[PDB]
Amino acid sequence: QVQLQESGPGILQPSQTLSLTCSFSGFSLSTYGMGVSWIRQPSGKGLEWLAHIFWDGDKRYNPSLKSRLKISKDTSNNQVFLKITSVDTADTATYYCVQEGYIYWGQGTSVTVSSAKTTAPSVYPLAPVCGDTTGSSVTLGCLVKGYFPEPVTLTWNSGSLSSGVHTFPAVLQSDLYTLSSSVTVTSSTWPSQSITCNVAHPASSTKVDKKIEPR
Amino acid sequence: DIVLTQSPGSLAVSLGQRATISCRASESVDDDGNSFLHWYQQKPGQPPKLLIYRSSNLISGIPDRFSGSGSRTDFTLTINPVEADDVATYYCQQSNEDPLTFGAGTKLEIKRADAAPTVSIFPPSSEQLTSGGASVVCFLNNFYPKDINVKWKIDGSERQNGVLNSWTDQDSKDSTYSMSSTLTLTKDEYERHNSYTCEATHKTSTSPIVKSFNR
């Protein structure tokens, strides 16, 4: 009904300014009581409110960050903007543009801040230490190490094997992300037919497949 | 600030029963006429779907199994009946006074029978050692509840720097969780020791489930 779309930069390094943009249709920043908010959710956690601009030009800020924030509205273009000056690693979040503070949330836009630069990963195989016959089970793994930026697309046997896969989340260790997946299949399955980890990193056009082979 | 204490932090429900999340505020969020507390649902990955606004008003399309109630300081969301697609984090948010503050969340997880973890350790791959790197992954798959402790032991000692832990969300086929713990060392270091142990401590057992290797 209303359309709220947020546009912003992909990756920003530290030191810089983040310029976000809310474009709204449906409502006027003229209406009595009207306004827009910016809210952000840090990567894996709570939602935090950043700033709020009103119809009457009045602006309201998050008392901790107000020293690095400025909301402005282009009512001729139907845009409001937020500018955070001096981004460091902790403003990695998803910024959402939100009508009168709660009623209509747009989609979000994901900002990553990092010195780091596009490094393709390393696919390392993990085949069993094993102590067989304590199950007719077997788990295998594939650790993807050192890549940037997110994302990677991991499969097993080129997505032929999908049940009893567990792909863990990417955790950025020293500027750089890591990620593992376990696949767990029955003993009749491996080594009888082969298992292959598939990783591809579209931010580098890295496509690797590592056969999991017995030790 | 108005501070909203959501409670409980987590809620384990069987499918088909009702659920009650309450959210308490330090001061009234009312106009001594209407009440500004609002309820959000967030399945991981999605943005926050608003469910109920101004204490009781249910958003369009939102299934009338969600009911909102309350004023001034104390509010309650009821999900009745809890269907399988309701598993998420819920937030309450006042927008009465700025700063607009959010509640910390409650995670509604499905309940199941206790399940201990199938742990596995995997030595570093030859490839990683070739690089002078040494990671030791221990995947501790499929368990219920979520509460678990990971201890790494190198030669009878607890080494706990270099440890990366990551966990999955609740498996929607068997309402289980899973975690990978990774110990990272350097080849120099790894070649200087023999036993590597991870020991997953968890309710379903009386003694640390211990999984280790020598060389």
TL;DR of this structure?
Chain A: GO terms for molecular function: antigen binding. Chain A: Disulfide bonds join 142-197. The complex is a heterodimer of chains A (215) and B (215). With 215 residues, chain A is mainly beta.
Describe this structure in words.
Chain A: One of its GO terms (molecular function) is antigen binding. Chain A is an all-beta fold and 215 residues long. In chain A, 0% of the residues lie in helices and 47% in strands. Chain A has no helices and 18 strands. Chain A has strands at residues 3-7, 11-12, 18-25, 35-42, 48-54, 59-61, 69-74, 79-84, 93-99, 109-113, 122-126, 139-147, 153-156, 165-167, 171-172, 177-184, 195-201, 206-212. The radius of gyration of chain A is 23 Å and the shape is elongated. Chain A starts with a strand and ends with a strand. In chain B, 4% of the residues lie in helices and 45% in strands. In chain B, the strands form 4 sheets. A 6-stranded mixed beta sheet of chain B has the order 2-10-9-4-5-6, with no helix packed on it. A 4-stranded antiparallel beta sheet of chain B has the order 1-3-8-7, with no helix packed on it. The N and C termini of chain B lie far apart (58 Å). Classes of the chains: A mainly beta (215), B mainly beta (215). Chain A binds chain B through residues 37, 41, 46-49, 52, 60, 62-63, 94, 96, 100-105, 107-108, 122, 124-129, 135, 137, 139, 141, 143, 145, 166, 168-171, 173, 178-180, 182, 184, and chain B through 38, 40, 47-50, 53, 91, 93, 95, 98-102, 104-105, 118, 120-125, 127-128, 131, 133, 135, 137, 139, 141, 164-168, 178-180, 182, 213.
